[PDB]
Structures are given as structure tokens and as C-alpha cells.
CSV table of C-alpha atoms and ligand atoms in Angstrom, one decimal:
chain,number,residue,atom,x,y,z
H,2,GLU,CA,-20.7,-76.4,64.7
H,3,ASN,CA,-22.0,-77.7,61.6
H,4,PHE,CA,-23.3,-74.9,59.8
H,5,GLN,CA,-21.6,-71.5,58.8
H,6,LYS,CA,-24.1,-68.8,59.1
H,7,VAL,CA,-24.2,-66.6,55.9
H,8,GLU,CA,-26.6,-63.8,57.3
H,9,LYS,CA,-29.1,-62.8,59.9
H,10,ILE,CA,-32.6,-63.1,57.9
H,11,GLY,CA,-34.3,-61.6,60.9
H,12,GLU,CA,-36.0,-62.1,64.1
H,13,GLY,CA,-38.8,-64.6,64.0
H,14,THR,CA,-41.8,-65.4,66.2
H,15,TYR,CA,-39.5,-68.0,68.3
H,16,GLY,CA,-36.3,-66.4,67.8
H,17,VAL,CA,-33.6,-65.4,65.1
H,18,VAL,CA,-33.5,-67.0,61.8
H,19,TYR,CA,-30.2,-67.5,60.0
H,20,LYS,CA,-29.4,-68.4,56.3
H,21,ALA,CA,-26.9,-71.3,56.8
H,22,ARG,CA,-24.7,-73.6,55.1
H,23,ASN,CA,-24.2,-77.2,56.1
H,24,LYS,CA,-20.6,-77.8,56.3
H,25,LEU,CA,-20.7,-81.5,55.6
H,26,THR,CA,-23.3,-81.3,52.6
H,27,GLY,CA,-23.1,-77.9,51.2
H,28,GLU,CA,-26.9,-77.4,51.5
H,29,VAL,CA,-28.0,-74.0,52.1
H,30,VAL,CA,-31.0,-74.0,55.2
H,31,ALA,CA,-32.6,-71.7,57.2
H,32,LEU,CA,-31.6,-72.2,61.1
H,33,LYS,CA,-34.2,-71.1,63.7
H,34,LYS,CA,-32.7,-70.5,67.4
H,35,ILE,CA,-35.6,-71.2,69.5
H,36,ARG,CA,-35.8,-68.6,72.6
H,46,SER,CA,-39.4,-82.1,76.7
H,47,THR,CA,-43.1,-82.3,75.4
H,48,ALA,CA,-42.1,-79.7,73.0
H,49,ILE,CA,-39.4,-81.8,71.6
H,50,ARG,CA,-41.6,-84.4,71.1
H,51,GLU,CA,-44.4,-82.5,69.6
H,52,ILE,CA,-41.6,-80.9,67.1
H,53,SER,CA,-40.0,-84.3,66.5
H,54,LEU,CA,-43.6,-85.5,65.0
H,55,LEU,CA,-43.8,-82.8,62.3
H,56,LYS,CA,-40.4,-84.0,60.7
H,57,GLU,CA,-42.8,-86.3,59.3
H,58,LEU,CA,-45.3,-83.9,58.1
H,59,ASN,CA,-44.3,-83.7,54.6
H,60,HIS,CA,-45.9,-81.9,51.6
H,61,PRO,CA,-44.9,-79.7,48.9
H,62,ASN,CA,-46.6,-77.0,49.9
H,63,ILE,CA,-45.5,-77.0,53.5
H,64,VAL,CA,-41.5,-75.7,54.1
H,65,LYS,CA,-39.8,-78.8,55.1
H,66,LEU,CA,-38.4,-79.4,58.6
H,67,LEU,CA,-34.9,-81.0,57.9
H,68,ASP,CA,-34.0,-81.6,61.3
H,69,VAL,CA,-34.3,-80.7,64.7
H,70,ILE,CA,-31.0,-80.2,67.2
H,71,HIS,CA,-31.1,-80.1,70.7
H,72,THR,CA,-27.9,-78.9,72.2
H,73,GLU,CA,-26.4,-76.9,75.0
H,74,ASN,CA,-30.3,-77.3,76.0
H,75,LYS,CA,-31.0,-74.8,73.3
H,76,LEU,CA,-33.0,-75.7,70.3
H,77,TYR,CA,-32.4,-75.4,66.5
H,78,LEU,CA,-34.7,-76.1,64.1
H,79,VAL,CA,-33.1,-76.5,60.5
H,80,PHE,CA,-35.8,-75.8,57.7
H,81,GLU,CA,-35.5,-76.1,53.8
H,82,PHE,CA,-34.6,-72.2,52.6
H,83,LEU,CA,-36.8,-70.2,50.2
H,84,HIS,CA,-35.8,-67.0,48.9
H,85,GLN,CA,-38.9,-64.8,49.5
H,86,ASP,CA,-41.9,-64.3,51.5
H,87,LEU,CA,-45.3,-63.3,50.6
H,88,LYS,CA,-45.0,-60.0,52.7
H,89,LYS,CA,-42.0,-58.9,50.6
H,90,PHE,CA,-43.9,-60.1,47.4
H,91,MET,CA,-46.9,-58.1,48.0
H,92,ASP,CA,-44.8,-55.1,49.1
H,93,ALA,CA,-42.9,-55.2,45.6
H,94,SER,CA,-46.5,-55.8,43.7
H,95,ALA,CA,-48.1,-52.6,45.7
H,96,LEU,CA,-48.3,-50.3,42.4
H,97,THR,CA,-49.4,-53.2,40.0
H,98,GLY,CA,-51.3,-55.8,42.3
H,99,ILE,CA,-50.8,-59.6,41.9
H,100,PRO,CA,-52.4,-60.9,38.8
H,101,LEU,CA,-55.6,-63.0,39.3
H,102,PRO,CA,-54.0,-66.5,37.9
H,103,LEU,CA,-51.3,-66.0,40.6
H,104,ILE,CA,-53.7,-65.0,43.6
H,105,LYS,CA,-55.7,-68.0,42.5
H,106,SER,CA,-52.8,-70.7,42.3
H,107,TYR,CA,-51.2,-69.4,45.5
H,108,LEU,CA,-54.5,-69.9,47.6
H,109,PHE,CA,-55.1,-73.3,45.8
H,110,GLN,CA,-51.4,-74.4,46.6
H,111,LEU,CA,-52.1,-72.9,50.2
H,112,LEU,CA,-55.4,-74.8,50.5
H,113,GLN,CA,-53.4,-78.2,49.5
H,114,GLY,CA,-51.2,-77.7,52.3
H,115,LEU,CA,-53.9,-76.9,54.7
H,116,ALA,CA,-55.9,-79.8,53.6
H,117,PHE,CA,-52.9,-82.0,54.4
H,118,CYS,CA,-52.0,-81.1,57.6
H,119,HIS,CA,-55.7,-80.7,58.8
H,120,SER,CA,-56.5,-84.3,57.6
H,121,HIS,CA,-53.8,-85.2,60.3
H,122,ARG,CA,-55.2,-82.9,62.7
H,123,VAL,CA,-52.6,-80.5,62.7
H,124,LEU,CA,-53.2,-76.8,62.7
H,125,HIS,CA,-50.9,-73.9,62.0
H,126,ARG,CA,-52.5,-71.2,64.2
H,127,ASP,CA,-50.5,-68.3,63.3
H,128,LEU,CA,-50.7,-67.8,59.4
H,129,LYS,CA,-49.6,-64.6,58.2
H,130,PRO,CA,-47.9,-63.6,54.8
H,131,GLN,CA,-44.7,-63.6,56.7
H,132,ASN,CA,-45.0,-67.0,57.0
H,133,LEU,CA,-45.9,-67.9,53.6
H,134,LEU,CA,-42.4,-68.6,51.2
H,135,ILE,CA,-42.4,-68.7,47.7
H,136,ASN,CA,-39.9,-69.7,45.0
H,137,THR,CA,-38.8,-69.2,41.4
H,138,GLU,CA,-40.9,-71.9,40.2
H,139,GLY,CA,-44.2,-70.7,41.3
H,140,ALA,CA,-44.7,-72.6,44.6
H,141,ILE,CA,-45.7,-71.2,47.9
H,142,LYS,CA,-45.2,-73.3,51.2
H,143,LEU,CA,-46.2,-72.6,54.4
H,144,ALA,CA,-43.5,-72.1,56.9
H,145,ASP,CA,-43.4,-72.5,61.1
H,146,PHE,CA,-46.2,-75.0,60.7
H,147,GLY,CA,-47.3,-76.8,63.8
H,148,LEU,CA,-44.7,-74.5,66.4
H,149,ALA,CA,-47.5,-72.8,68.0
H,150,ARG,CA,-48.8,-75.8,69.5
H,151,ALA,CA,-45.2,-77.0,70.6
H,152,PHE,CA,-44.0,-73.9,71.9
H,153,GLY,CA,-46.9,-71.6,72.6
H,154,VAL,CA,-47.0,-68.2,70.5
H,163,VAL,CA,-45.1,-57.1,68.5
H,164,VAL,CA,-47.1,-59.8,67.3
H,165,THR,CA,-49.5,-59.5,64.6
H,166,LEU,CA,-53.2,-60.2,65.1
H,167,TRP,CA,-54.5,-59.3,61.8
H,168,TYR,CA,-54.9,-62.8,60.8
H,169,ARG,CA,-56.5,-64.4,64.2
H,170,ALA,CA,-59.9,-65.9,63.8
H,171,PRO,CA,-62.8,-64.5,66.2
H,172,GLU,CA,-63.0,-67.7,68.3
H,173,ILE,CA,-59.5,-67.3,69.4
H,174,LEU,CA,-60.0,-63.5,69.7
H,175,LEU,CA,-62.9,-64.1,71.9
H,176,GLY,CA,-61.0,-66.5,74.4
H,177,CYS,CA,-62.1,-70.1,73.1
H,178,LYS,CA,-59.7,-72.6,74.4
H,179,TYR,CA,-60.4,-75.1,72.1
H,180,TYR,CA,-60.3,-74.1,68.4
H,181,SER,CA,-60.0,-76.0,65.5
H,182,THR,CA,-58.8,-76.3,62.2
H,183,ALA,CA,-61.1,-73.5,61.2
H,184,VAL,CA,-58.7,-70.8,62.6
H,185,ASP,CA,-56.5,-71.2,59.7
H,186,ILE,CA,-59.1,-71.0,57.1
H,187,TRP,CA,-60.1,-67.9,58.6
H,188,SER,CA,-56.2,-66.4,58.3
H,189,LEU,CA,-55.9,-67.9,54.9
H,190,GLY,CA,-59.4,-65.6,53.9
H,191,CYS,CA,-57.6,-62.6,55.5
H,192,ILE,CA,-54.5,-63.1,53.2
H,193,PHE,CA,-56.7,-63.7,50.2
H,194,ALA,CA,-58.3,-60.5,50.9
H,195,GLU,CA,-55.0,-58.9,51.2
H,196,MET,CA,-53.7,-60.1,47.8
H,197,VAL,CA,-56.6,-58.9,46.2
H,198,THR,CA,-57.0,-55.4,47.6
H,199,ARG,CA,-53.2,-54.8,48.6
H,200,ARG,CA,-54.1,-53.6,51.9
H,201,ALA,CA,-54.8,-55.9,54.9
H,202,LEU,CA,-58.2,-56.6,55.7
H,203,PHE,CA,-58.6,-56.3,59.6
H,204,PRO,CA,-55.2,-54.4,60.7
H,205,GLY,CA,-56.1,-54.2,64.3
H,206,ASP,CA,-53.9,-52.8,66.9
H,207,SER,CA,-55.1,-54.1,70.1
H,208,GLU,CA,-57.3,-57.3,70.7
H,209,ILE,CA,-60.5,-55.2,71.2
H,210,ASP,CA,-59.4,-53.1,67.8
H,211,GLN,CA,-59.1,-56.6,65.8
H,212,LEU,CA,-62.3,-57.3,66.9
H,213,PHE,CA,-64.0,-54.6,66.6
H,214,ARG,CA,-62.6,-54.2,62.8
H,215,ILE,CA,-63.8,-57.4,62.2
H,216,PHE,CA,-67.5,-56.5,63.7
H,217,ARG,CA,-67.3,-53.3,61.5
H,218,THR,CA,-66.8,-55.4,58.2
H,219,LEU,CA,-68.9,-58.6,58.8
H,220,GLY,CA,-71.3,-57.3,61.4
H,221,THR,CA,-71.7,-58.0,65.1
H,222,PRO,CA,-71.8,-61.7,65.6
H,223,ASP,CA,-75.0,-62.8,67.5
H,224,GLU,CA,-76.8,-66.0,68.4
H,225,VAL,CA,-78.3,-66.2,65.0
H,226,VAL,CA,-75.2,-66.3,63.0
H,227,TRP,CA,-73.4,-68.0,65.7
H,228,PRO,CA,-75.1,-70.2,67.9
H,229,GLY,CA,-73.2,-70.0,71.5
H,230,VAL,CA,-71.1,-67.1,70.7
H,231,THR,CA,-73.2,-65.0,73.6
H,232,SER,CA,-71.3,-67.7,76.2
H,233,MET,CA,-67.6,-67.7,74.8
H,234,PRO,CA,-65.4,-66.3,77.4
H,235,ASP,CA,-64.6,-63.0,76.2
H,236,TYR,CA,-67.9,-61.9,74.7
H,237,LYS,CA,-69.4,-59.1,76.2
H,238,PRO,CA,-73.1,-58.0,75.8
H,239,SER,CA,-72.0,-54.2,75.5
H,240,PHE,CA,-70.2,-54.8,72.4
H,241,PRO,CA,-71.4,-52.2,69.9
H,242,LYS,CA,-73.9,-53.6,67.2
H,243,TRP,CA,-72.6,-53.1,63.8
H,244,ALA,CA,-74.5,-54.0,60.7
H,245,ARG,CA,-72.7,-56.4,57.9
H,246,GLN,CA,-71.4,-54.7,54.9
H,247,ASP,CA,-71.4,-56.4,51.6
H,248,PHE,CA,-67.9,-58.1,50.1
H,249,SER,CA,-68.7,-56.2,46.7
H,250,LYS,CA,-67.5,-52.9,48.9
H,251,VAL,CA,-64.6,-55.2,51.1
H,252,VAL,CA,-62.6,-56.9,48.1
H,253,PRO,CA,-63.5,-55.1,44.8
H,254,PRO,CA,-62.8,-56.0,42.1
H,255,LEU,CA,-62.9,-59.6,42.9
H,256,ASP,CA,-65.6,-61.6,41.1
H,257,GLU,CA,-68.5,-63.3,42.3
H,258,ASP,CA,-66.8,-67.0,42.7
H,259,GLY,CA,-63.9,-65.3,44.6
H,260,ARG,CA,-66.3,-63.5,46.9
H,261,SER,CA,-68.4,-66.3,47.7
H,262,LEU,CA,-65.3,-68.3,48.2
H,263,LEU,CA,-64.0,-65.4,50.8
H,264,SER,CA,-67.4,-65.2,52.3
H,265,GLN,CA,-67.5,-68.8,53.3
H,266,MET,CA,-63.6,-68.8,54.7
H,267,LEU,CA,-64.9,-65.8,57.0
H,268,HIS,CA,-68.2,-67.1,58.5
H,269,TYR,CA,-68.3,-66.5,62.0
H,270,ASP,CA,-69.3,-69.9,63.1
H,271,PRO,CA,-66.2,-72.1,62.9
H,272,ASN,CA,-68.7,-75.0,62.4
H,273,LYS,CA,-70.1,-73.3,59.1
H,274,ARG,CA,-66.7,-71.9,57.9
H,275,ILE,CA,-65.8,-73.7,54.9
H,276,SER,CA,-63.2,-76.8,55.0
H,277,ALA,CA,-59.6,-76.5,53.0
H,278,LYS,CA,-60.8,-79.6,51.3
H,279,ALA,CA,-64.3,-78.3,50.3
H,280,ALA,CA,-62.3,-75.3,49.1
H,281,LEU,CA,-60.5,-76.9,46.8
H,282,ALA,CA,-63.7,-77.9,45.2
H,283,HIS,CA,-65.2,-74.2,44.8
H,284,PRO,CA,-66.0,-73.4,41.1
H,285,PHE,CA,-63.5,-70.2,41.8
H,286,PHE,CA,-60.8,-72.9,40.9
H,287,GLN,CA,-62.2,-74.3,37.8
H,288,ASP,CA,-59.7,-72.5,35.8
H,289,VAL,CA,-56.8,-72.5,38.1
H,290,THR,CA,-53.5,-72.7,36.4
H,291,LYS,CA,-49.7,-72.4,37.9
H,292,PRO,CA,-48.2,-69.0,36.7
H,293,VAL,CA,-44.4,-68.2,37.6
H,294,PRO,CA,-44.2,-64.8,39.2
H,295,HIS,CA,-41.6,-62.5,38.2
H,296,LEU,CA,-39.2,-62.3,41.2
H,297,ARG,CA,-35.7,-60.6,41.9
H,298,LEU,CA,-33.4,-62.2,44.6
X,1,ES4,CL1,-37.6,-67.3,57.6
X,1,ES4,C1,-37.4,-68.3,56.4
X,1,ES4,N1,-36.6,-67.6,55.3
X,1,ES4,C2,-36.4,-68.4,54.2
X,1,ES4,N2,-36.5,-69.7,54.5
X,1,ES4,C3,-37.0,-70.1,55.4
X,1,ES4,N3,-37.6,-71.5,55.4
X,1,ES4,C4,-38.2,-71.5,56.9
X,1,ES4,N4,-38.0,-70.4,57.1
X,1,ES4,C5,-37.5,-69.4,56.6
């Protein structure tokens, strides 16, 4: 009752998203209609505020249906990439976005909150050059065609107790996609996703990932592929970038770089904040 629905933005991971106007403040928001532990978990996310996290304005439980009211941003990274397809995103903008995302992740991760489902459609961008993580923490609160392209290998191999490393893996994949203008691992099934990772990074074994062979969905029968070079996977990215991406894509989640450690990487020595070129 307190909103006017302006337009259907589309059908997100958990239900429909609407651009809406608050009838008692005039503020324009994103309203997600979600299709009691969940209420408590979600309610805690109202406190998780950071400039690179899309702000959860409010949570409204009524007719025992659930509405999440979020800060509105006019574009996402998926559409920005599609619109930059001919030309590519300039490196300093790639670098700025990656840095800001890592700040967001470092913040949530220092509170033990993970995203678990990062994807370009979840990264929202404004006119001032800011990029922000949307739907943060909703996977744990509500559980999760859905995209597998960004999933870490420990999730695909059936680990129940994965860690903040899963987000760094996703963000690596998005980094590589910004650079190349093609998804890194566009699997169309769980095994196709796994085998696309293995074809690129080599089939993992006990040498690179202690314990891998005891994971729930690991099979001794997986084909055995050798690793390729990152010079072939993300050209023409420079050696700092490739060094960072390689650390974000380590098979072992314990050796994978943390968001905080990544913010200190030399790739970011010369980071700036450009303003993107955006048509709304
Ligand atoms: Cl899907 C979407 N679109 C625009 N703004 C948003 N804020 C949170 N989700 C959003």
C-alpha cells in the first residue's frame, strides 16, 4: 500500500523486482517480493552497511509474504558489459570496480557474511563511478535458469561448509569476464561447469588441493586435463592482473587470496576512480 510500482524490473533470483516510489517519502527504491529464521537472518542484514553494498532499507513481512526494500541503482554490470562489447571496459575502470568490490567483500567477510551467489547481474553501478554488491546474504537466509558460471569448485564438488573464499572465486571469474568480454567458465550443467574449470586450470589433485579426492562429489574417473597459462586465458591483461587473478582462482580455498590481502596487491598501486559513460 505504501508504494507505487513504477515498472517491473524483472524476475530476480528470489522473486519479482519492482522499481517503486514510496508514497510517504517520495524515495524511489527497488522492491523485491520474496517467493522465521529467515526473517531474523534477513533482519540482521539491515545492519550490514557499507558504500559498496546495496543498502537494505527495510524488510516488510505482511500477509505472510515478504518484501525487501533496497536502494535503487540504474544499471548493472551485465548490461554495462553488453553495452561495452565492441569496445571493452577501459582497464582503469575495470581496476576501480574490482577494488571497490573487494572493499565490499572485505567488509562483509570481516563480519562473517558471505554472498555465495555473486554474478554480473548482482553488481549494480551508478553515475558517480560506484559499483555495489546486491542480494548480499540472501542465499543463506532463503537458500538458492540459475547461473553456475561463477560457482567455486568446492561448491560444485558438494562441500557443505564452504567459506568466504567462494566469493573471491566468483569475483575472479567476473574480473576475467570484464577483461575478455566473454564469460570465463560458461557451464551449462554442474559437470560441464566443473569440466570447463578443469580444462582451463587443470584437473585438481591432492598435490594442488589437499583433501580434494575426499570431497562428496569428487570422482576418481574425472578426466585428467593439464593446466593452461593465464596469458592464454585473459589476454591482454598485464602481469600484475594475471598474478592477482591466478590467486583468486587457486583451487584450494585455503590458499585462495582473501579480499583484504587482494586490496594490497600491486595491481592496485595505481588505482583511480573513473566515471563511467552511462545512458539511463
Ligand atoms: Cl535488481 C535492482 N535493480 C535496481 N536497483 C536495485 N537495488 C537492489 N536490486 C536492484
